[PDB]
């Protein structure tokens, strides 16, 4: 029923188009769309820690850990086929997860299709 637009053939696109911002997510407790961490236990997506001087995120991911005890979280936008930034609230350090692929797959995430943001 739909017809080809009379503009399709000669549509004038801008010469210097600011490549649209890569896709993303949003903390489920605030408006942050950057510095987001997905907890590997429940798949919650929350923002990074707030630092003493006010920099950082809004502390939602760490508060989630305090409440649940779920230790691992991966930083969205850092996932590539070779790995990703994973933090352990438990061990207080960035760690490696040999089973990251399975862990991410658990929530319907193809660790191979993800692109570093």
């Amino acid at each position: 029923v739909r017809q080809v637009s009379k503009h399709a053939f000669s549509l004038k696109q801008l010469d210097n188009p600011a490549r649209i911002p890569p896709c993303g997510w949003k903390c489920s407790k605030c408006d942050m769309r950057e510095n987001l961490w997905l907890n590997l236990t429940d798949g919650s997506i929350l923002c990074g820690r707030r630092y003493f001087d006010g920099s950082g995120g809004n502390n939602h991911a760490v508060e989630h850990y305090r409440e649940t005890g779920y230790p691992l979280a991966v930083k969205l936008g850092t996932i590539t086929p070779d790995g990703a930034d994973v933090y352990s609230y438990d061990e207080d350090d960035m760690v490696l997860d040999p089973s990251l692929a399975e862990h991410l797959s658990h929530f319907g995430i193809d660790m191979l299709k993800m692109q570093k943001t």
Binding site: W37, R49, F52, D53, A61, V62, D85, Y87, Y89
Partner: protein
Amino acid sequence: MQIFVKTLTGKTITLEVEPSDTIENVKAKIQDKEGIPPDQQRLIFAGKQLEDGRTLSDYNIQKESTLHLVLRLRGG
């Protein structure tokens, strides 16, 4: 002996310590005066990051030396 620490804002705080105090002890002293938890602190002396488990004398930190406090960054 007294040593000075430049805070995140550039302010100067003074601490009473001994050459044998550990970096952990020092960070505890900083929490007492500035309110920043030790695990959120990162201390630098003459460009060198001070490590827990080491003492002030290990870094040749003496009377009236000045340390620099910066944020210890971490994920999560």
